[PDB]
């Protein structure tokens, strides 16, 4: 008797929720650390303007959201509904990001 | 001496012809710059600017908002066939995406 | 101490906004986006113009270069209205001198 | 003092539910468990290429701070032009 | 009596044409097309012969590359045959198509 | 008298099936659905329009009536299909 | 009075430092051009040219051919992971493509050659 | 008229470098055309980015340091190391000649 939504229905609901919005979807501090981690590998003791870290995050999430759209088309192309890493790898190969 | 009229005012333009003209001379595009150029360029910059704000404004109205914000610009651009092409490799911060859910992913009812 | 001058297109975007939607306003973030746009396209047109003049062995970017640059860079209908509005503005600026 | 920067393995801070949200915006309905790690690697490669160029722009300017323009010029070079942070 | 199985002469041709560098579209038809497409931009146009070659070189390169990408989409859907949806998905993902 | 040029129509069909197959072969295609050949023609035509448009634009800016390999080379660069061996 | 020493020889280059320096000044890049800019640049162009020529020359030699042809340049470039990336949105007229047939398209049976 | 105008190229140089690298191999005109396109392509990329750099940092001057930073930006890993190396060596040698 307790209410339960069939699988797909809360997912479809999330899609709508997030397509309506523009908030960044990666949590800010984790992101900010990762950037600095990665930045060490090229130069030591670098500071960032916070707008520089926001500009990167804006740019990343935009690229990933974009890549997911192409990944979803590749998944559907093969008569599926479930994105899998070969979808991502195909998208990026056709995109020419990858060999 | 005669009175100062701006070149924008002479062109019936809101964009700064004089500034554009200086940006052209100072941006390493050519040794020389004709006086028609910045007038024409500032013109096009004004047209496209107006075009986007026409469409961005309508989206702010549909959203019951007095002020244009990035999402309104993004909706304006991504629903207009030509503006989208013009800006097809451009990311608009804080814009989000157009609502799109492939048909196959919807319920059968 | 007064901050050093960062120019922008923001008084001109507003002026156009009042022409087009007298009741409507604009946030900082939107203005930043408008301003990025204007610079982007400035550089695209000016760039293609620089190439055009250079390909044709000429020292001078004229309106004829800006125009052919516009033809190459903007899509059909957008190209047409730009060319019209750019011609208007010149033809007009010439008659005033 | 000078407070060393501890490389904590933050790529794992890019959580599963975060990756899932990004995919919802992208219109993805269903997600293989293999996705969340594939993504992290895809994200890392993205971040390295942008941050390398950005930091190159920083170095040439003889600055110790990466600015938002360094990042913008970087994304322009990588063909991923960003509006709203200058330029 | 003698006959090869389907796909055998196909593979043979793949080997043949990846080994060579000659243009594969026939030159005069290609030229006629160029002239025709050009007419919708400016009447009574002339063409340097190298400009036509330059456009054929480009086209053929464009298409050969598109077919590579098209094949991968076919194979991704567990197919050996290319179909228009494979060309469409490739072109969608390349940014050419809406 | 003297007469200027005349109209050509549906030359896209001169891009035959064998040649479409040959191109696909070079692209490593083994089996081709029969709807490909008309799709490929569509795609090829869009490519040529976009490149010839831009080349011809360069022609008229040079106040010429002859399209030159450089007009094509410059157009293809703008299209991001930079080509080597014709005047780069 | 005492004359005639070409900047390129000074730098130890075949590439023309003076042509390169002229091309920078006249090419709408910057108001001024410093004296190392064209030396450095010419050197880099010489370096990349010499790589491709080395590799393509090898390709022509494997072909039992005295002369380099576009295919020798293509084969050189596309089998060098790095040259391939530098020149990945670039089309080499008359180069063709590298031999390559996806495995799912082959037949699978092995029974072999002499 | 009577004599066609002069159109510069890097041919003599490409050849000079060719004799260094392989003394007994030649080069067809098409192949040489590709090499000339190559040099001009890259010149334009490096000068281009050098141009941005200077402008981005409010310098009027493209110096050897802008070429270097641009070279780091445009070439991939190994190629850029050797490229910066040869660029560094050449400027060095050139100041020694004085
Ligand atoms: Ca209105
Ligand atoms: Cl003018
Ligand atoms: Cl210098």
UniProtKB/Swiss-Prot annotation, chain A:
Q: Which residues carry this modification: N6,N6-dimethyllysine?
A: 43
The PTM entry states:
Acetylation is generally linked to gene activation. Acetylation at Lys-86 (H3K122ac) by EP300/p300 plays a central role in chromatin structure: localizes at the surface of the histone octamer and stimulates transcription, possibly by promoting nucleosome instability.
Q: Where Phosphothreonine occurs, residue numbers?
A: 44, 71
Q: Which sequence positions carry the modification called Phosphoserine?
A: 21, 50
What intrachain disulfides are recorded?
Answer: none
Locations listed in the record: Nucleus; Chromosome
The answer to whether UniProt assigns keyword Repeat to this entry is no
Quote one Gene Ontology molecular function term.
Answer: DNA binding
Query: PTM N6-methyllysine: at which residues?
Result: 1, 20, 28, 43, 86
Any one annotated GO CC term: nucleosome
How does the annotation summarize its subunit structure? The nucleosome is a histone octamer containing two molecules each of H2A, H2B, H3 and H4 assembled in one H3-H4 heterotetramer and two H2A-H2B heterodimers. The octamer wraps approximately 147 bp of DNA. Interacts with TONSL; CHAF1A; CHAF1B; MCM2 and DNAJC9. Interacts with NASP; NASP is a histone chaperone that stabilizes and maintains a soluble pool of Histone H3-H4 dimers.
Similarity-based family? Belongs to the histone H3 family.
Q: What is this protein called?
A: Histone H3.1
**Organism expressing this protein natively:** Homo sapiens
Q: What is the lineage of its organism?
A: Eukaryota, Metazoa, Chordata, Craniata, Vertebrata
- In the complete protein, the residues contained here run 38 to 136 of 136
UniProtKB/Swiss-Prot annotation, chain D:
Glycyl lysine isopeptide (Lys-Gly) (interchain with G-Cter in UFM1) crosslink residues? 16
Localization per Swiss-Prot or TrEMBL? Nucleus; Chromosome
* Record-level Gene Ontology MF annotations: DNA binding; protein heterodimerization activity; RNA binding; structural constituent of chromatin
Q: Using the record's annotations, give every residue carrying the modification N6-crotonyllysine.
A: 1
Provide the positions where the record notes the PTM Phosphotyrosine: 36, 73
Modification N6-(2-hydroxyisobutyryl)lysine occurs at: 1, 16, 29, 44, 62, 64, 76
Q: Which residues carry this modification: N6,N6,N6-trimethyllysine?
A: 5
Q: Where is this cross-link: Glycyl lysine isopeptide (Lys-Gly) (interchain with G-Cter in SUMO2)?
A: 5, 16, 44, 64, 76
Give one GO biological process term. Answer: protein localization to CENP-A containing chromatin
**Phosphoserine: which positions carry it?**
32
Residues that the record marks as modified (N6-propionyllysine) are 1, 16, 29, 62, 64, 76
Instruction: Tell me where in this chain the PTM N6-butyryllysine is found.
Output: 1, 16, 29, 62, 64, 76
Consequence when changing residue 76 to Q: In TEBIVANED1; results in severe early developmental defects when expressed in zebrafish embryos; results in defective cell cycle progression when expressed in zebrafish embryos
Q: Which residues carry this modification: N6-acetyllysine?
A: 1, 16, 76
Which positions carry Phosphothreonine? 65
What name is this protein filed under? Histone H4
Please name the source species: Homo sapiens
Q: What is the lineage of its organism?
A: Eukaryota, Metazoa, Chordata, Craniata, Vertebrata
- Portion of the full sequence shown: 17 to 103 of 103
UniProtKB/Swiss-Prot annotation, chain F:
**What are the Phosphoserine sites (modified residues) in this protein?**
33
Report the disease annotation for this entry: Tessadori-Bicknell-Van Haaften neurodevelopmental syndrome 1: An autosomal dominant disorder with onset in infancy, characterized by poor overall growth, microcephaly, hypotonia, profound global developmental delay, impaired intellectual development, poor or absent speech, and characteristic dysmorphic facial features, including hypertelorism and abnormal nose. Other variable neurologic and systemic features may also occur.
The entry's stated outcome for residue 26 to C is:
In TEBIVANED2 and TEBIVANED3; uncertain significance; does not affect early development when expressed in zebrafish embryos
Q: Known post-translational modifications?
A: Acetylated as part of spermatogenesis progression prior to histone-to-protamine exchange.
Q: Where N6-crotonyllysine occurs along the chain?
A: 2
Q: Which species?
A: Homo sapiens
Q: Which InterPro entries match?
A: CENP-T/H4_C (IPR035425), Histone-fold (IPR009072), Histone_H4 (IPR001951), Histone_H4_CS (IPR019809), TAF_TATA-bd_Histone-like_dom (IPR004823)
Q: Which gene encodes it?
A: H4C1
Task: Tell me the residues on which N6-lactoyllysine occurs.
Answer: 2, 17, 63, 77
Q: Which residues carry this modification: N6-propionyllysine?
A: 2, 17, 30, 63, 65, 77
Is Zinc set as a keyword in this record? no
Instruction: Give the Phosphotyrosine positions (modified residues).
Output: 37, 74
Where in this protein does the record say N6-(2-hydroxyisobutyryl)lysine is found? 2, 17, 30, 45, 63, 65, 77
N6,N6,N6-trimethyllysine is found on: 6
Modified positions (N6-(beta-hydroxybutyryl)lysine) are 17, 63, 77
Question: N6,N6-dimethyllysine occurs at which residues?
Answer: 6
Q: Cite the location of the cross-link Glycyl lysine isopeptide (Lys-Gly) (interchain with G-Cter in SUMO2) from the record.
A: 6, 17, 45, 65, 77
The entry's protein name is Histone H4
Q: Which UniProt keywords apply?
A: Acetylation, Chromosomal rearrangement, Chromosome, Citrullination, Disease variant, DNA-binding, Hydroxylation, Intellectual disability, Isopeptide bond, Methylation, Nucleosome core, Nucleus, Phosphoprotein, Ubl conjugation
* Effect caused by changing residue 49 to Q: In a breast cancer sample; somatic mutation
From Swiss-Prot, chain H:
Positions spanned in the full protein: 29 to 126 of 126
Q: Which GO terms describe its biological process?
A: antibacterial humoral response; antimicrobial humoral immune response mediated by antimicrobial peptide; chromatin organization; defense response to Gram-negative bacterium; defense response to Gram-positive bacterium; innate immune response in mucosa; killing of cells of another organism; negative regulation of tumor necrosis factor-mediated signaling pathway
Task: Name the domain of life this protein comes from.
Answer: Eukaryota
Describe, as the record does, how this protein assembles with itself and its partners: The nucleosome is a histone octamer containing two molecules each of H2A, H2B, H3 and H4 assembled in one H3-H4 heterotetramer and two H2A-H2B heterodimers. The octamer wraps approximately 147 bp of DNA. Heterodimer H2BC11 and H2AZ1 interacts with VPS72 (via N-terminal domain).
Q: Which UniProt keywords apply?
A: Acetylation, ADP-ribosylation, Antibiotic, Antimicrobial, Chromosome, DNA-binding, Glycoprotein, Hydroxylation, Isopeptide bond, Methylation, Nucleosome core, Nucleus, Phosphoprotein, Ubl conjugation
The glycosylation sites annotated in the UniProt record are 85
The entry's protein name is Histone H2B type 1-J
Instruction: Tell me which residues bear N6-methyllysine.
Output: 19, 81
Record PTM N6-malonyllysine, positions in chain: 89
Cellular component GO terms held in the UniProt record: CENP-A containing nucleosome; cytosol; extracellular space; nucleoplasm; nucleosome; nucleus
Q: N6-acetyllysine is carried by which residues? A: 58
